[PDB]
Amino acid sequence: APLRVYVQCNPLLDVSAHVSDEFLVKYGLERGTAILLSERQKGIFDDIEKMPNVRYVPGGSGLNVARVAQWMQQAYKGKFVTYVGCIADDRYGKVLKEAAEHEGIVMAVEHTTKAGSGACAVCITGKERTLVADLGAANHLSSEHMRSPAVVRAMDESRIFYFSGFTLTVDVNHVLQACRKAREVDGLFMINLSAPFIMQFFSAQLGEVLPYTDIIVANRHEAKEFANMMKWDTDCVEEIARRAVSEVPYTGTKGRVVVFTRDIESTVLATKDGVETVPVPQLDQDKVIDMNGAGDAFMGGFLSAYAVGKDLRRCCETGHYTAQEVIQRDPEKPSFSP
Ligand SMILES: Nc1ncnc2c1ncn2[C@@H]1O[C@H](COP(=O)(O)OP(=O)(O)OP(=O)(O)OP(=O)(O)OP(=O)(O)OC[C@H]2O[C@@H](n3cnc4c(N)ncnc43)[C@H](O)[C@@H]2O)[C@@H](O)[C@H]1O
Ligand code: NA
């Protein structure tokens, strides 16, 4: 029976379409990056929606992670992951809540009338996806909600706490509440770095949370951006991981773990005990489809194995399995267990 997992992020509906390179130029976008919607992107949602074959699917980084983790523990629907974020009681909000609850996630979400539920433009150019997130309701997640009975109950019963780095743009204090709770319950606190812009523009917030963070998960690019933020003169992912273990402030007792994924190259796994690499199983690249990304899916599999007490390398193997499944989607039960 898996340990209970608490996930917090921004629940967003993904609005996905294939766009031209000129579409990216028009909107001031850098291919393959994620940003928050700004005035520079005025009109982008109307434009993408006016297209053929646009898709509307529940998204949000942490909600993706929660759904992949729950998919790996289907005997524990209602009894495994609780997700916290803020939505409106609108069409998008109802769909995000329904998809997650149908899958067995407990959706301890706030409702606001201050903005409509968030959405993310997912602009697909060949093999790459460029993401523009309009948080809407997600940016209004309140301290009142964080102290509400449903949320405190969920935190009290959970032993693994996962926040996306994307939460750092809302209110760092919400994150710190979970950081302190993880200590209270002798649990684990984990964050993903989410995007280079987190390190570029939310470094103060990230700095507040890192000392309380047991496991830091990122990809190759975010690891290099983290090195840049730290002023570390290295692009060596193994070395960046080594230094994030021992040089980034840490006040916990569970042990600091750093996990940096490298797409087809091996995943870097570091602890006080040393640095290892975990190979990614060979996959025919003609099976990799341009629909889904791999990062949240990796994190979902990682948490599904961590929750049942598997060693760190096995957690990585499980994340590779789930990531490889998700990127091949154009599937009822997993064919791999931690
Ligand atoms: N402000 C915000 N707030 C909240 N949500 C927000 C937000 N902004 C955007 N979002 C949300 O973000 C979601 C999309 O997130 P996500 O699903 O994570 O997609 P992504 O961010 O585009 O991730 P990448 O595909 O680039 O993966 P990665 O670089 O992290 O992993 P890696 O390549 O190392 O690969 C990892 C592993 O996968 C496997 N793998 C990957 N590629 C291959 C390959 N080609 N062949 C074999 N294995 C592979 C390997 O095992 C590897 O270790 C959307 O739903 C959106 O709503
Ligand atoms: Na991601």
Residue numbers in the entry: 4 to 333, 338 to 345
Paper text:
Adenosine kinase (EC 2.7.1.20, ATP:adenosine 5′-phosphotransferase) catalyzes the phosphorylation of adenosine to adenosine monophosphate (AMP) in presence of Mg2+ and utilizing ATP as the preferred phosphoryl donor. Recently T. brucei adenosine kinase (TbAK) was identified as a key enzyme mediating high affinity adenosine salvage in the purine salvage pathway. A common property of adenosine kinases from various organisms is their control via substrate-inhibition to prevent non-physiologically high intracellular purine nucleotide levels, and recently it has been shown that TbrAK activity is strongly inhibited by its substrate adenosine.
The bisubstrate inhibitor AP5A was co-crystallized with TbrAK which adopts the closed conformation in presence of this compound. AP5A exhibits an extensive hydrogen bonding pattern with the protein either through direct or water-mediated interactions. The interactions in the adenosine binding pocket are mainly water-mediated, apart from the side chain NH2 group of N13 which makes a hydrogen bond with nitrogen N1 of adenosine and the side chain of D17 which forms bidentate interactions with the two OH-groups of the ribose. The phosphate groups of AP5A are stabilized by water mediated interactions and by the side chain NH2 groups of R132 and N222 and the backbone nitrogen of A297. The adenosine part of AP5A in the ATP-binding pocket shows hydrogen bonds to the side chains of Q288 (to the free NH2 group of adenine) and Q327 (to a nitrogen atom of the pyrimidine ring of adenine), and the ribose moiety is stabilized by backbone interactions with D266 and T270.
